[PDB]
Design goal:
part of a larger assembly, 5 chains, A: 225 residues, mainly beta, Immunoglobulin-like, 2 domains, elongated, B: mainly beta, three-stranded antiparallel β-sheet, binds 2-acetamido-2-deoxy-beta-D-glucopyranose, Immunoglobulin heavy constant mu (chain D), Immunoglobulin mu Fc receptor (chains B, E), immune system
Chain lengths: 225, 107, 225, 224, 107
């Protein structure tokens, strides 16, 4: 009887560039001949979804309906309603979802932080941390590119947006990339790229290597017979 | 290097308004108060929600695009000697300052 | 009916230096003088479940039955049960919990990363981050000690334990302390203290200061020869 | 029959994380079927004494009885009693143990002195000294952590506390650990860890290494 | 650098209980009289039981959480050269000196 609405996540909109909104019809009694569609504010039908879901292991019905739509229509602030029909429902289910807008957008401010020299003594693993602070809403994507090409999602780890202690409504996140010792010693650069709506160009990035912090070292050597 | 010196008498019930150039659009405009001990400048309020601990609830900001004027308004003043307050913009603080103003509080 | 249990956690065992275990009954009818209590493995009665709370004002029931058994048994392996009987269910229900025995041990290695120079350039707020990594048991308790006595929990934020990218079963964790900028320039210890049960003394401290990452700039090797 | 009770001590309770209060008896005539019982203020059941001691060399028997409690009970003022009953007494003996309340607390600041330059000329062994001073009461227990793993308790020595010379109630205590210069000059860290009640976490520590007194700016190392 | 100035007058036992801010934070608190000859500061009264040798019995301290105040009172003044006394907190002294005062003992 329930219809959750899975919005297109900015991680998915940015990773795939093919934004699709899902109509997760959950907890119906299992019956056949189920059609799920979508309409925008004007109420007209959309393309039929693929990948029909199976019945839930909880002896109930779980279905997914995804529609690929133009991104400007999704960000226009329109109302998008999934239309669900069934045999046990006296009336079709009319699931309305839109932007949870009305939030003060703040651009993320990335700050890279390199491994401490105490870590760089075992010569086992360096952990570069891409601390992201002062951003709203609670949505952000972080990738790690080296020499211009990205890296596997299994090498770096990203946390979840926790609320900031001294700033309500503003979140922060973390991200760790674990390299081996020698690559960071060769000075090979690493790039942390952050995608978020409030960014002026929707994408920012920062760079780091061995020689970021290293100042000038006047090694003098007096001598007078 | 400009020194638009503006002053006031300043007591406790008096409220002080400081005019800063609006840099236009949005670029982290802030008001910074020089730290005499450190010899450098220290932020008191910026575009972000930061407000200095002793200045909590005592400072407010008003941007005026119609006049391009940035008003820093302090409702209650007291012993806080008006040393130097600098209007500034941008991420870095010391690079982004202009109006190096100072004003007395007693008379 | 809902009968859930809160077994003692390592942080809870640590800060109070005592062990408290509770079980909660939820979604019962709004009825007073219900029967909820705790008992031991042998069936011995425990200290009374004092401080009973009021029902949840959404027509549900909210009351917790607690018990104070010292740590001498929690590390032995004797599972506990709490008796729950009520007008809805007259049969006394038992809620069985025990510590998760059968987990490896790994020393939680700890580092401090000072704020990036970009933070200081804003003259706005530093964010010292205590990183803990490579510990096998999930739970770990991290807090911040300034000048040797504690700070309020509303000035630092601790991330939940997360699985490691490359390590098989170990975990990592972050803590961030958002100090005032000018205070870090003055310089304080800001000791990050971590408590975890694989440590020898179960306590480890790290500390950093403004004059901790400063490198030498003059290798004035003067030789007379 | 003379009773002799050893209450739990902070070092003992903390090193093994297992509280254990004990009472033995001397002057007890050598005879079997000795009776050692333990009771609380409420006088409930206890753990039965195990591995009873044998007779003393001077033709008298030794009976020892220990018990395990919850640690907060010892700090709650509970005066646990042990009853010693045998067949050589006119009246059964008992001895009651309570924590010495009324004592002040003072945080032991831990200072770590590196070995002297004179000692680092003979080139056989340096001696790092950990100086636990200005604490109250006296029950500290130090240990030397060497890069994560502990060290054998025969490589370091601790001393019983003495009263402070100038401070009335403040005590102090020493500790030494011996190394050899060929590893001390290498620069690996050595840490002194101190456990005492007055500490905010009951554990504090300090670190030292050979490159600690150096000013870390420049390292004017004139050669020949 | 915040600095008050309590100048006194009693040539005998006419003391004065200097008022110092409380961190309320349970760190060591102290008063430190600057050593003119050395050019640095020297502790006289601390949270610990220390009392300066010449000031034994003549100086006491009171903490007021109700008023958040730290009163250092000297019952008898030897009319000696009264330098600058700084209230402070924390382990290290010269870091912790918050406010500094100087008061004449004679008139
Ligand atoms: C890498 C490098 O240039 N190291 C030099 C070393 O060769 C030179 O002999 C001495 C004095 O300048 O110290 C430094
Ligand atoms: C980083 C560095 O080179 N530090 C040097 C060290 O190598 C050298 O042994 C010492 C004098 O011998 O002077 C210092
Ligand atoms: C510093 O100078 C010493 C002088 O002997 C030399 O051995 C060492 O290599 C120098 N270090 C660097 C980093 O140049």
């Amino acid at each position: 009887i329930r219809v959750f609405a899975i919005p297109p996540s900015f991680a998915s909109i940015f990773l795939t560039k093919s934004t699709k909104l899902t109509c997760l019809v959950t907890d119906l009694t299992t019956y056949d001949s189920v059609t799920i569609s979508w309409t925008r504010q004007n109420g007209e039908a959309v393309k039929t979804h693929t990948n029909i879901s199976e019945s839930h292991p909880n002896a109930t019905f779980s279905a997914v309906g995804e529609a690929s739509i133009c991104e400007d229509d999704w960000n226009s602030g329109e109302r998008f309603t999934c239309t669900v029909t069934h045999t046990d429902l006296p009336s079709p289910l009319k699931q309305t979802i839109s932007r949870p807008k009305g939030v003060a957008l703040h651009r993320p401010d990335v700050y890279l932080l390199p491994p401490a020299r105490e870590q760089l003594n075992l010569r086992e693993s360096a952990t570069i941390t891409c601390l992201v602070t002062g951003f709203s809403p609670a949505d952000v994507f972080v990738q790690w590119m080296q020499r211009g090409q990205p890296l596997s999602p299994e090498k770096y780890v990203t946390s979840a947006p926790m609320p900031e202690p001294q700033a309500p409504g503003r979140y922060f996140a973390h991200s760790i990339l674990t390299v081996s010792e020698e690559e960071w010693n060769t000075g090979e650069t690493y790039t942390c790229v952050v995608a978020h709506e409030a960014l002026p160009n929707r994408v920012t990035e920062r760079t780091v290597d061995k020689s970021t912090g290293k100042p000038t070292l006047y090694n003098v050597s007096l001598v007078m017979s | 290097r400009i020194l638009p010196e503006v002053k006031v008498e300043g007591e406790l019930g008096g409220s002080v308004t400081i005019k800063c150039p609006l840099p236009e659009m949005h670029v982290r405009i802030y008001l910074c108060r020089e730290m005499a001990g450190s010899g450098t400048c220290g932020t008191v309020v910026s575009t972000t929600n930061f407000i200095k601990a002793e200045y909590k609830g005592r400072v407010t900001l008003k941007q005026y695009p119609r006049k391009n004027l940035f008003l820093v308004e302090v409702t209650q003043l007291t012993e806080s000697d008006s040393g130097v307050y600098a209007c500034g913009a941008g991420m870095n603080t010391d690079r982004g300052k202009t109006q190096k103003v100072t004003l007395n509080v007693h008379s």
